[PDB]
Design a protein around this nucleic acid. Structure first.
Ligand SMILES: O=P(O)(O)O[C@H]1[C@H](OP(=O)(O)O)[C@@H](OP(=O)(O)O)[C@H](OP(=O)(O)O)[C@@H](OP(=O)(O)O)[C@H]1OP(=O)(O)O
Ligand SMILES: [Mg+2]
Ligand SMILES: [Zn+2]
Ligand SMILES: [Zn+2]
Ligand SMILES: [Zn+2]
Lengths: 55, 255, 45, 268, 242
RNA sequence: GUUCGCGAAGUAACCCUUCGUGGACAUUUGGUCAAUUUGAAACAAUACAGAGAUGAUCAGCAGUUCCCCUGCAUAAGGAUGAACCGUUUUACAAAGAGAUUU
RNA sequence: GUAUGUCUAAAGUUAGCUCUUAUUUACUAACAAACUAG
């Protein structure tokens, strides 16, 4: 059984786990990007597995 | 078959129950058509009407008008105008869903509007983002009127019930959580079965509780999530990649 | 598709704009180009 | 002076749609249907808000079914608009119900005319429109004044008693009242119904009435002084100090109110 | 006031199509902001009325049309074209769909083409990823054994129906076993005539058994701990066949 | 169905009727919308507390808000309408002195 | 005593020191000798 989420106090209440809270990715610059987004996603997924086993 | 005959009057106009719900409050709110000043006792109920496909299928005005949106009250089993209903009063077959190929990812097979994502209850109409085919089937406790059964018999009853409603991919009743997961060949068959077994019962007429059929609260057919074991994620990813390779061939043939 | 667009006669009793609704919206302040901020140029305070 | 380019009317703008339809019915049927439809519309205005305990009676008396909370007294109060609708429909239902008590065969035509002249000269007693719109009292006084003329030209050789039913000029006075408060009720109920469907405009910004000379004058002078210090002070990025220098300002103002010399050691 | 994105498949095979604009029609089904809604009919005498269900900014953020909710260039779903772009560029281009209301409004008002919309937007990179796609494609009851979990029930009905001329069926996927059932005496004789023989669906081999017992789903197992164990034992029995 | 023109029968009958034919009058509605749950109203039912300055009892007006409600409202009211208090480390240096590895 | 706030499965999402004990003092109570709230 998973955890309750807190009640929507108002009809447009924001739940801050599903999405980015407000997507404000930086303005595109002249340098290439994806080679370190891969490192970020790999390190984040390893942190996800580590929280799955240690927390 | 059903292409030969005409569709039957499943219920008279006078033989419908009233739109005023069961009294769950003090006074009747005629804007939202509901009850207020109190909330004790379930709004939910066992539906009095079932589908019975092989008897009540047939050819309506909707075949003459060329429309291929199905009938939400055929699936509930509660149409008054049987052969004159504008929608279709038969099971969604392969050719009808094939003519639904232009609009079934926007609307469902009843003409209802698919929303952004699911509800918090995961039950309703559905999304235009998931090509959702698997139906969660809960609420089996009151659907049996809390009768002690083995899980294989309940799985057999759910298999025989949802075999009436189109082509089946895969059914798996969960013994530990008392729920099924009925996956279909098409999305429209899943939509039609969700409307079809909405709040009915798994009770057979061969059992003693057939007079007290409409006592508890019936089934709970809802849209299901992904199947979180990695084997079904594996079969999902490889079937999606094979359908993507088919669409690769289509995009190369187009341009 | 050469299309004639025909705005219908709405019902005069209904809400003329049923999509119109009170809602609070946060608009993104996007940055298309980075704007220069140019400022060319102790104990008493 | 009336507007000269008013080619648009109300009903002439509703004939030209596909929704309204022309027919010929009895006046009493039209009155009974406007009573039924007014009851349905006010009942739906009540029931959309969730005020299901306000049993709007068929004679348009709003009565709470049970005694209330305060939360069920805040949502269940309504403005001059809804109640003004309710009182004009009380008035019209009294009119149409006296014509019905005629048409049913119960009451005489003379007793109909006296009943109507009783309605149109006791709107302030039978109905209650004087509460929610007080310039109705003008018309109510005029109706009383017309009563005071007509009962002493109808009763020269008759003395005192009921029976007078020359209801024409009081009827004119209430029709001129309705001539005045058609567009009033159009704007009021347009704002109410768009609050019910569209909702409250979220940028309600409050104009400075006589409760807010002090607070908004404080915000005025405080923003002015803080802009003056931020102009004067060199190269300081504001995080915390911008909040605190103004305290000296308010300190000085209390030092001005106490007539104490505002001497602070180390101020520039 | 931008004109709508409605592709050639929603409007249909007509040249003169009369649509109806309603300014501020309804909330769009992505961001719940109101917009000018265009509803029409594909023919003049069509029974189905087809309306735009998303606003113009949500259409151009996904490079999709407003009616059939598929791609403007390719007429395919958003999830699958994002999957195809992930197959091409080796980069998981996914469409980040919102779930909070304020996030929906925020994510629609910004000037960007999110997801895989930028690739299919201009036709140059569209045909670039198209010939990359071409480069990728250059590179009376019965019992049933040997049903891997990627074999549905409807394919087992369809192949048996195709080998005959056209009857229910019961398959325990967690036990990886199958069964078939009908009533006609001659239908079983014709099933024997059109053959432990092998059913070949998609080269995946399914062995048949004339099952004289009347099987229920309890015959395939009563529990889930029986199903996996019987599947392992029956795969070892298949190795005993081999 | 109404009318105009023609032919054929009753009929070797310019009266009338029937049958057959060409034309004209008349020309594409309605749906953003499906009839009880599963596309979302909120109050009320239970139980407990029971108000912002602090030693108490309070009048308030404000501000921020990706909180709204009642209100015709740019008035007014909603406890000063409610949440506000919570965490709290780097635009980080320079001089001088001694104790340590080489 | 209000405003107002908070809680409430019917529906199952797939693997010095330690101590007992009494007196005093302070703040609180719609608790008592038919009614009083921002
Ligand atoms: O109390 P009075 O000074 O004697 O006047 C009354 C009174 O008229 P006012 O409204 O001016 O006071 C009555 O009105 P209501 O009591 O009903 O409000 C009215 O009776 P009706 O309105 O029922 O006709 C009656 O007039 P009358 O009895 O002659 O019909 C009239 O008496 P006066 O004629 O002597 O002024
Ligand atoms: Mg107060
Ligand atoms: Zn029907
Ligand atoms: Zn949108
Ligand atoms: Zn389209």
């Amino acid at each position: 059984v998973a955890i309750k989420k807190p009640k929507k106090k108002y009809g447009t209440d924001i739940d801050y786990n599903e999405d980015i809270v407000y997507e404000q990715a930086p303005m595109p610059g002249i340098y290439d990007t994806s080679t370190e987004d891969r490192q970020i996603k790999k390190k984040f997924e390893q942190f996800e597995r580590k929280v799955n086993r240690k927390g | 078959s059903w292409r030969d005959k005409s569709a039957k009057v499943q219920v008279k106009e006078s033989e419908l129950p009233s739109s005023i719900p069961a009294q769950t409050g003090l006074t009747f709110n005629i804007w939202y058509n509901k009850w207020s000043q109190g909330f004790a006792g379930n709004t939910r109920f066992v539906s009095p009407f079932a589908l019975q496909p092989q008897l009540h299928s047939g050819k309506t005005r909707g075949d003459n008008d060329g429309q291929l949106f199905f009938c939400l009250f055929f699936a509930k089993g509660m149409c008054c105008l049987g052969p004159k209903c504008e929608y279709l009063h038969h099971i969604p077959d392969e050719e009808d869903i094939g003519k639904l190929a232009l609009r079934t990812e926007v609307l469902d097979c009843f003409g209802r509007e698919k929303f952004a994502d699911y509800r918090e209850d995961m039950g309703g109409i559905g999304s235009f983002r998931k090509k959702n085919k698997t139906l969660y089937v809960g609420g089996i406790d009151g659907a049996l009127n809390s009768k002690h059964l083995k899980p294989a018999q309940i799985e057999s009853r759910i298999r025989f019930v949802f075999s009436r409603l189109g082509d089946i991919d895969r059914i798996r009743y969960v013994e530990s959580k008392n729920c099924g997961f009925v996956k279909f060949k098409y999305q429209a068959n899943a939509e039609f079965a969700k409307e079809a077994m909405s709040n009915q019962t798994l009770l057979l007429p061969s059992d003693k509780e057939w007079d007290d059929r409409r006592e508890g609260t019936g089934l709970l057919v809802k849209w299901a999530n992904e199947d979180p074991d990695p084997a079904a994620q594996k079969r999902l990813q490889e079937e999606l990649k094979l359908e993507s390779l088919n669409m690769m061939v289509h995009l190369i043939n187009n341009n | 598709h050469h299309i004639e667009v025909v705005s219908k006669q709405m019902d005069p009793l209904l809400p003329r704009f049923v999509g119109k609704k009170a809602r609070k919206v946060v608009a993104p302040t996007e940055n298309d180009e980075v704007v220069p901020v140019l400022h060319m140029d102790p104990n008493e305070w | 002076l009336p507007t000269n380019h008013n080619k648009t009317k109300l009903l002439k703008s509703l004939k030209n749609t596909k929704y309204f339809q022309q027919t010929t019915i009895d006046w009493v049927e039209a009155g009974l249907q406007l009573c039924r439809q007014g009851h349905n519309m006010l009942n739906l205005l009540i029931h959309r808000k969730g005020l299901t305990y306000l049993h709007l009676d068929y004679n348009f008396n709003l009565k709470p079914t049970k005694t209330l909370t305060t939360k069920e007294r805040k949502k269940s109060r309504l403005g001059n608009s809804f109640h003004l609708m309710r009182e004009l429909l009380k008035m019209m239902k009294l009119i149409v119900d006296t014509h019905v008590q005629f048409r049913l065969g119960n009451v005489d035509a003379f007793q109909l005319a006296d009943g109507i002249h009783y309605i149109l000269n006791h709107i302030g007693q039978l109905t209650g429109i004087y509460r929610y719109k007080y310039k109705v009292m003008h018309q109510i006084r005029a109706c009383k004044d017309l009563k005071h003329i007509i009962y002493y030209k109808f009763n020269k050789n008759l003395g005192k008693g009921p029976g007078c039913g020359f209801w024409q000029p009081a009827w004119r006075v209430w029709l001129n009242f309705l001539r005045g408060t058609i567009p009033l009720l159009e704007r009021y109920i347009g704002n109410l119904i768009t609050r019910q469907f569209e909702g409250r405009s979220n940028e309600i910004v409050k104009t400075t009435t006589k409760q807010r000379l002090d607070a908004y004058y404080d915000l005025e002078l405080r923003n002015s002084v803080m802009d003056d210090i931020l102009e004067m002070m060199p190269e300081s990025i504001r995080q915390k100090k911008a909040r605190t220098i103004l305290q000296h300002l308010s300190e000085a103002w209390r030092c001005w109110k106490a007539n104490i010399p505002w001497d602070v050691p180390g101020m520039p | 006031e931008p004109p709508p994105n409605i592709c050639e498949q929603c409007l249909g095979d007509e040249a003169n199509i009369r649509m109806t604009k309603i300014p501020q029609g309804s909330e769009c089904k992505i961001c719940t902001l109101p917009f000018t809604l265009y509803h029409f009919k594909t023919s003049k005498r069509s029974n189905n009325i087809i309306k735009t269900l998303i606003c113009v900014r949500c259409a151009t953020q996904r490079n999709i049309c407003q009616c059939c909710m598929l791609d403007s260039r390719w007429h395919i779903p958003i999830q699958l074209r994002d999957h195809l772009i992930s197959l091409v560029n080796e980069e998981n281009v996914m469409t980040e769909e919102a779930k909070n209301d304020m996030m929906k409004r925020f994510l629609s008002l910004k000037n960007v083409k999110l997801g895989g919309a930028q690739i299919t937007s201009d036709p140059s990179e569209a045909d670039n990823i198209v010939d990359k796609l071409k480069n990728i494609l250059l590179r009376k009851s019965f019992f049933l054994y040997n049903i891997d979990a990627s074999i549905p029930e409807w394919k087992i009905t369809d192949t048996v129906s195709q080998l005959l001329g056209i009857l229910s069926l019961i398959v325990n996927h967690k036990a990886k076993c199958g069964g078939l059932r009908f009533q006609s005496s001659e239908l079983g004789e014709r099933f024997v005539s059109k053959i432990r023989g092998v059913l070949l669906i998609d080269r995946f081999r399914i062995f048949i058994i004339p099952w004289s017992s009347g099987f229920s789903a309890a015959s395939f197992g009563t529990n889930t701990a029986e199903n996996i164990k019987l599947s392992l034992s029956l795969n070892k029995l298949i190795q005993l066949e081999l």
